C-alpha cells in the first residue's frame, strides 16, 4: 500500500510527504515506530529549524515509553510540531495529539479521540509514570489533575468537537 | 504490479501521475493512511485539478472509511468517484461522497449500502452519523436510509443512480 | 520474471506493456482485476487510438472482478483484441468473448469452457442471467442456449469456440 | 461431555431415552452418525417415537438428504424440535419431522434460505428444485412461493415458522 | 479434571447432584452440552431443583437463547449462581433463573453490556433480548435498552438492586 | 460417535453386532483394511447370515476398492449394499458389487460411475479390469460402460436401478 | 499423573479422596472452575471435615482468583492452605485466604504479594478490593498493604509468618 | 476401528494378523510381537498374515521375515489389494503351499533403491532368498526386482510367488 | 541468480535473454508457461528473423501449460532451437521434440522420457490423443508406436532419442 | 552478501566479471540451471579465456550434476576446478571433470567419491558416472566401482594421488 | 544495515571498500562461501595491501572454517584478525589464523578454544588432529597442551589469549 513518486528521483508517498515536512503516524506505537518518528523529527529539524513540521495521527496508541520518546523529541526541537488527527487518536496517540504546538493541534470533523490510558513491570512504577502522564495532560489542556486522573481511567470516546472543548486540540478543521 | 518508465514506477504510481487513485480492497487503517496520503500529495501538486478515485471495495472499517471521507471533503480539488466492480458498505459510502455531478459507476458495477453490525452505544452513535451524511448526499430521507443501510440489498448501477448514490452511469 | 533494459529497466510483462500487450495468466480475483483495469486505463491515456492486446490463460474467478475488467474493456475507446493461449474457463472465457468484434483469437490447442460455477442465492442467480444475457449478445447465441451451456462443464476446442461465436478466428501457425 | 452411571456421556445417556441431538453444521461425519443412531433406535424399537433436537446452521445438501431419507425410511415417528437455530439444510430437516410433531422453542430462529456457493451448476439446480418440491409438500405452500423464499435470507420467528408450516407447534413453558 | 469413584469426572459427580457448571464462553458446543444436561436432569426427576453455576465471559446469542429456552421449558426450578463473572449472554442466563433463586457470591462481577448477519436481524434479536431482561429484572425496556448498550461492571449487591439476582450469598 | 451399553460399544460396534458395516468415507488402504476385517470377523461369527454394507463414499483408491471387492466375493455370506447419500467412483463400484437382488439405494441417494484419472499403461490396464466387472454385474455392454465410466454424470437412485447398478430403490 | 487402584484413581483423584486439592499452576478460568468444582464436591460429601489446599502457583486472573476465594469463604468446611514452592500475586492472596490458624508454608517456600498491572478504573477498583481483604486477613493496615502489593517483594516462609500471610512454618 | 477389543484385536484371537500399511520399524515391532504372542498360545496351529502393503524399510521387512521363519507355526500369507517391494517379499515368504492372493490382488517384486555397498550387499541376499522361495534362478530375480512390473495374482502363481489364487 | 552490468543491471537469465536464450529449467505449471510465452513474445517483437534458443531441463508438468508453450513456439516467426541439458520428461520431452526442424539438440549425458503420466477422464484421454498425434508428426514414428510408448516409462539416452526422432542431433564436445 | 560498485553488484556477480563461478551448495535443478547459465554467458563474452569454478559442495542431484558436467565439456574455454572446504559425490565428480592439469584443492579440503543410492535405471546412470570417473582419474573401472560404493574421505594429497585433482595449492 | 552513498552501499560493502570484512555470525557453508568470495575479491583488487577481518563469532562448521582458513593462507596479502565481542571454537581458530604480528582483540573480547564434539567418529577425530596441530604452530604451544585445552570449555580474556599466543596484541584506546 505505498505508491512511488518520481520528480524530475523516486520516493514512495510518505518519503514525498516528508519532503514537505509531513510525518505520518498511522499505526500502533512501539519502539520501531518511535525510532522512526524521532529520526524524521531530527532530520527535519536539521533541514530547517524555523519551518513548521506537520505530524498526522491515526493511531490506536501503544507503549508509554515509546510514546514518551516521541513526546520529548517534539518538545526538544526548535520547530513547531503541528498535530493533526485524521482517523483515531487513542491513549498514547491522543497524548501525542495534545502535545502539538499550542494553537496548532487539529482534527478532522469525524476523528475519534480517547484519553483512556489502559492498565513485566512493578505496579508502583506503572502508577508512577501514569501520574507523570496526568500531570502533562493537565497542563497541555488546562484541566485540573483531579479531572484528568478520573477521565484517563475510563474509556470515553470523544468527538473532534468534544476534544476541542476538552482542550486536547485547538481547532476542528472545516472543509 | 508492472513497471513503467517515462524514472520508473509501478502501474498505480503511473496512474497517480494522472491524479488517478485506485481503491481496490477492503478498507483498513493501512489503506486509509495510504489513500489520505495520496490525496494530500495530489492536493499540493495542484489544488485546482480534479482527482479520480476508482472504487472496487467490499468495504471495511468505519473509522478508516471516515478518515478518507474527511480528507475528500477537506482538500480543495474535486474528487470524482468511479465504481468499477463493487462498492459495499463503507465503499458505497465513499462512492456517494464524491464531488456532486461527479459520482459514476460502470454499467455492470454493483452497490450495496448495508453497513454491517466497541461499546455498542458508540457504534450506534457513529451509525446515526453515517445515515445523516447518506441522507444529505443522496437526497433520500433519513428514515429511508435508516431502513436501507440495515438491509443487504444489491443495487444495479441504474438503481444506484435512481437512488442518488451516483450522478451518472458511464456508457461506452 | 526476467529483466529488460533499454539504453531504462522493465520486467517482461512491463516491456510487453510498452507494446500495448497485457498478460492475464491466472485466476481472476480482486487483485488481478485492479491490476488489469489499471493497465487498461494506463494504455488508454498513452494513446486512445491504438489497439490493445489481452492474452488470456485463466481457469476462472470472481464474477465481480471479471465484470470490472469487462466494463473497463468496453468503456475505453481502443479496441481490445483478446487472445486465448492455454485455457479460458468460466470468467476467463467471458473476457475472451469480451474482445472487439473480429479480434477475438485462440491458438490451435487452446481450450475454452463457458461453464460458470455457482450472498443470498437470489442475487447469484440474478447476476447469472446478466452474464448469460451478455454472452448471448457477444456470441450470437440465443439466451436459452447460453443458459443450458453455462450450466454444464463443457470443453470447447479452439475451432468449436469459433463455431460458438466466442472467438472470431483460430490463429494459424 | 460429562459421564453418567455402565458409563455414558450425556448424548449416549440421552440416546437411551431415544433422543438424538443435531447440534452442528451438517457434513458426512455428522450424517453417518445421525443415520447410525436412527438405525440403532429402529433396531431397539420400531414403534416408539424418536426425538431429534436441532441446533444447526445448515450444511451439505447430500448429507442433509442422507438424514432426510433415513428419517422417512425407518418405521418410528421422528419428532423434530428446534432449539436455537435451524438454517438451510437444518430447517429442511426440521420441516421433515413426523406430521403433527414438528416443534420449536419460543425464541428459536428458523431460516429456509438454501445457499448456492455456501459439481456442474445444472446438477445443483436439479437437486434444488427437488428440495423446493419437498418443502412445498411438507409446509402446504406453493412450489412457487417456496422457490422465492428459499432463494432469500429470512429469519423466521418460531411463530412465523408455525404460520409458515415449517413446524406444527411452538412449545410453551 | 479429577475422577471420583463406578467412575465419574467431578462435573459428572456434580451432575449426579443436579449441579451443572457453566464455566466458559457460550458457543453452540457449550449450548448443546448444557441443553443436554437439563433434558437429562429433567427426565431423571421433574420436581427436584437444578443448580446452574455461572462463570462466563459471554458468547453467541443463538447459543444463549438455546439454553434460555430449555431452562424455561423444563419443569424443575433452575437456580442460577454466579461465581466469578457473568458478562453479556452469561448475565442474561443468570437473570434467566427461577425468581427467588438467582444468586451471586460477594465478589462476583456482572456486566449486562450486549456487544455488537444482516444489521436489521441483529437489532431485531437485541430488542427481543432487552424485552426479556426487562421482564425478568422488573426494569423498564427504555432503561435496559440504555444499559445493555454501555459497558459497565456491577457489584453483586448492585446486580441485586438491579433485579438480575435475588440475593448475594453471604458467607 | 455415541456410546451404547448393553445388558459398552460405540454406535458402529453396536451395528456390527447386527452385521451392519458402515462405509462412510473416502476409500484408502486404512479404510479398506478396516472394512475387510469387519467382513472376515462377521464371516467367522456366522457364515450363513446376510451382511449389510451401507455406502456413503466419494470414492477412493482402486487397489483399496479391490481389496474390499475381492473380500465381498470370497466370503460365504451374501453382502447387501445400501447407498445412503452418495456413491461415486469406487464407492459406486462397490455398491454394484453386493449380492444380486440385494443392492439398494434410498430415494435421494446419488451415484456416479465416473472413474477419475504408476505408469499410464498400468492405470489403463486395471481400468479395463474395472469396466469388465461393471459390465458383468450390470448387464451393460463393455462398450457402453467405457463411455460412461469416462464421463462424470450424476445418477438418480432410479436411474441407477435402470442402469443395473442397483436392484431396488427403497420405499418409505 | 499415574494410576492408583483403591476403581482407578490418578494421584490427584486419590488425594481428592483424602480431601486434598492441589493448585499447581497459573490461575485461569479452567483452573478456577476445576478448583471450585472440587470444593463443591468435597463440601457435599462432608461439610465438617477439613479440606487441604496445596498451593504452588505463579498467580493469575483476578476474577478467576476471586471465584476460588468466594467459594472457600462460602462452603462450611475449613480450607487449610499450604504453600509448597511458591505463592505469587493471586497465589499469595489465596494462601492468606485459608482458615484462620490453618495457613501454612514449607520452610523454603516463597511468597510474593505483588499484584501485577478492562477499563483502568475497574482494575483499580478491584485492586482496592484485594487490599482491604488482605488487610482483614493479615492484621496489617490497608496503607502498608496498598504499598507492599504495588512492589516486587519476595517473602521468606518466616517473613510471611511475620507478615500475617501464613500462620505457621511447617516443622520437619 | 470398532470395538472388549478393537476389530484387529478380535481377529488376533483367531490367529489373524493384518499388515495393511507401509512397513517401517513401528509396524515391524508390532507384527513380530503379534507373531511371538501367537506362538506362546499355541506353537502348532497356523497363523494367517494378510498383506496389503506398498512396502517399506528393508531392515524392518527382514525383522518380520526372520520372525516368520523362526517360529514353529506355519504362517499363511494372503495378499489382498497389493503387495509391493518388501510386502511382496513377505508374501513369498509364507509357508510353502500356503501363500495366496485374491483374484484382483496386485503383486510387484521391484525393490527400489548408509554406504551403497551395504545396501547392494543386502539386496543380493533378498534376490537369493526370492530365488529359493519361488524356484526361479537368481539371475532372473536380479533382472526382475530391478524393474517395476505389476503381476496379476495368476501371473504371481505362475512366477512361484504364491501357491494359489483364492476362488470366490 | 547473479548480476551482470553492460549501467544496465541484469540477472544471468535476463543477460541470456539479450542473446535470445530462454531457459526452461523447472516443472511446467501456469506461472512458468506464462513466463516462457511472454519471453517468446518479447524476443519475437525484438527480431522476428533471428533464431531463439530454448534450453530444457524439466521433469514435465501441466498439459495445458505445455500446449500454451508449444502453440507459441509454432505461432511466432523465429526458429526456436531446443536444447536438452540434463532431463526432458513428459511435457519437457514434448516441448523438446517441438523445436525447429534440424535444430533440436541434446547434450551427450541427457535423459529424455516420453511417458505422459495419468476434469472428466474422457477429456484427459482426448488431449492425450492430441500429444500422440503431434509426437507422430514430429518424430516420424507411427501413432501406434507412440501411443504404446507414451503409456510406459522408458528413459532414453541422447543417442536413443536421436534414433527415435525426438532430437535431430547429439551435441559433440 | 555485500554490494560492490564500479555499476552495482553483489560479490558473486563481481567475481563473475573475473570469470569466477562459485558452486557453494548442494546441487539441485536450480543450482544447475544457474551454473550452466553462468558458463554459457562466460563463453559468450570470451571463448578462449579460462573459467574458474570453485567447489564447496556436499553433492546433489545426478541429473543436475550431469547438466553442469555436460556444459563444461561442451564449451570451448578451459574450466579450472578448485575445491575449497568439501567436494562430495556429485561435488567430487564435478571437481574431477575440470580441465586436465587445472584441477585443484586447498591443503585442508576434503573430497568424497561416494555416490549414494526403477532400480535398473539408477544402476545404469551409476555405471555411466563410474566410467567417466575412471577416464578422468585414470583409474580402472573395477576400482572406481569399489570406491564409489564406499564412504571414503580423501585428503587433498590423497585426491591428488587418486587423480581427482592435478595439484594441491600451496600457501 | 544503513546505506552509504559515495554509488550506494550497505555499511558492510562500504567497509569492504576499505578492505574490511566482518565475520559476525555462526560459521556455516553460506558464511564461508561469502567470506572466501570477499577474500578473493580483495586479493584481485590489490594483492599487497592488508585485509582486516573482524571476528565476532560463536564458531560453527569445521569444513566451513577450514575453507576460510585455507583461503587466508593461500591469498598473498596479509589478513589481520580482530576479535570484537566473542571468538569461540572455529571463530577462535580463525582468529589465531591471521597474519603473525597482526592478530588483535578489543580489551573485553572473549576467546574460547574449545572445539565441540553426518560423518563417522574416525574422520571427526582426524580433522580435529590437524586443528590441534595447526593451533600448536600458530600459538607456539605444545601439541600435548593444545589437545588438552581444546577438549575443555575455558574462556580466555583478551589478555589471556595474548599470553596463550592466539593473538599478538590487545588493542589500546
From Swiss-Prot, chains B, G:
UniProt KW Glycosyltransferase keyword: no
Annotated catalytic residues: 89, 114
PROSITE patterns membership: CLP_PROTEASE_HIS, CLP_PROTEASE_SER
Record EC number: 3.4.21.92
Compartments where found: Cytoplasm
This protein's UniProt keywords: Cytoplasm, Hydrolase, Protease, Serine protease
Function (record text): Cleaves peptides in various proteins in a process that requires ATP hydrolysis. Has a chymotrypsin-like activity. Plays a major role in the degradation of misfolded proteins.
Subunit structure: Fourteen ClpP subunits assemble into 2 heptameric rings which stack back to back to give a disk-like structure with a central cavity, resembling the structure of eukaryotic proteasomes.
Name of the featured protein: ATP-dependent Clp protease proteolytic subunit
Organism listed in the record: Staphylococcus aureus (strain MW2)
Organism phylogeny: Bacteria, Bacillati, Bacillota, Bacilli, Bacillales
UniProtKB/Swiss-Prot annotation, chain F:
Principal subcellular localization: cytoplasm
Cellular component, GO, one term: cytoplasm
Pfam family, one: CLP_protease
Keyword DNA-binding annotated: no
The reaction(s) this protein catalyses: Hydrolysis of proteins to small peptides in the presence of ATP and magnesium. alpha-casein is the usual test substrate. In the absence of ATP, only oligopeptides shorter than five residues are hydrolyzed (such as succinyl-Leu-Tyr-|-NHMec, and Leu-Tyr-Leu-|-Tyr-Trp, in which cleavage of the -Tyr-|-Leu- and -Tyr-|-Trp bonds also occurs)
Enzyme Commission numbers on file: 3.4.21.92
Recorded GO MF terms: ATP-dependent peptidase activity; ATPase binding; identical protein binding; serine-type endopeptidase activity
Active site: 89 (nucleophile), 114
Organism: Staphylococcus aureus (strain MW2)
BP GO annotations: protein quality control for misfolded or incompletely synthesized proteins
Family label: Belongs to the peptidase S14 family.
InterPro entries: ClpP (IPR001907), ClpP/crotonase-like_dom_sf (IPR029045), ClpP/TepA (IPR023562), ClpP_His_AS (IPR033135), ClpP_Ser_AS (IPR018215)
Main function: Cleaves peptides in various proteins in a process that requires ATP hydrolysis. Has a chymotrypsin-like activity. Plays a major role in the degradation of misfolded proteins.
Protein name: ATP-dependent Clp protease proteolytic subunit
Entries under PROSITE patterns matching the protein: CLP_PROTEASE_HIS, CLP_PROTEASE_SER
Organismal lineage: Bacteria, Bacillati, Bacillota, Bacilli, Bacillales
Subunit note: Fourteen ClpP subunits assemble into 2 heptameric rings which stack back to back to give a disk-like structure with a central cavity, resembling the structure of eukaryotic proteasomes.
Subcellular compartments: Cytoplasm
Keyword entries, A-Z: Cytoplasm, Hydrolase, Protease, Serine protease
Entry annotated with the keyword Protease: yes
Amino acid at each position: 500500500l505505498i505508491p512511488t513518486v518520481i520528480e524530475t528521483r523516486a520516493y514512495d508517498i510518505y518519503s514525498r510527504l516528508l519532503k514537505d515536512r509531513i510525518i505520518m503516524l498511522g499505526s500502533q506505537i512501539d519502539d520501531n515506530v518511535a525510532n522512526s518518528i524521532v529520526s524524521q523529527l531530527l532530520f527535519l529539524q536539521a533541514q530547517d529549524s524555523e519551518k513548521d513540521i506537520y505530524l498526522y495521527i491515526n493511531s490506536p496508541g501503544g507503549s508509554v515509553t515509546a510514546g514518551f520518546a516521541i513526546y520529548d523529541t517534539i518538545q526538544h526541537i526548535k520547530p513547531d510540531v503541528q498535530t493533526i488527527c485524521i482517523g483515531m487518536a487513542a491513549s498514547m496517540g491522543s497524548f501525542l495529539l495534545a502535545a502539538g504546538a499550542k494553537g496548532k493541534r487539529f482534527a478532522l470533523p469525524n476523528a475519534e479521540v480517547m484519553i483512556h490510558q489502559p492498565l513485566e513491570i512493578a505496579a508502583n512504577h506503572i502508577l508512577k509514570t501514569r501520574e507523570k502522564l496526568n500531570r502533562i495532560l493537565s497542563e497541555r489542556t488546562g484541566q485540573s489533575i483531579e479531572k484528568i486522573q478520573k477521565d484517563t481511567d475510563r474509556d470515553n470516546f470523544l468527538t473532534a468537537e468534544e476534544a476541542k472543548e476538552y482542550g486536547l486540540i485547538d481547532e476542528v478543521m472545516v472543509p
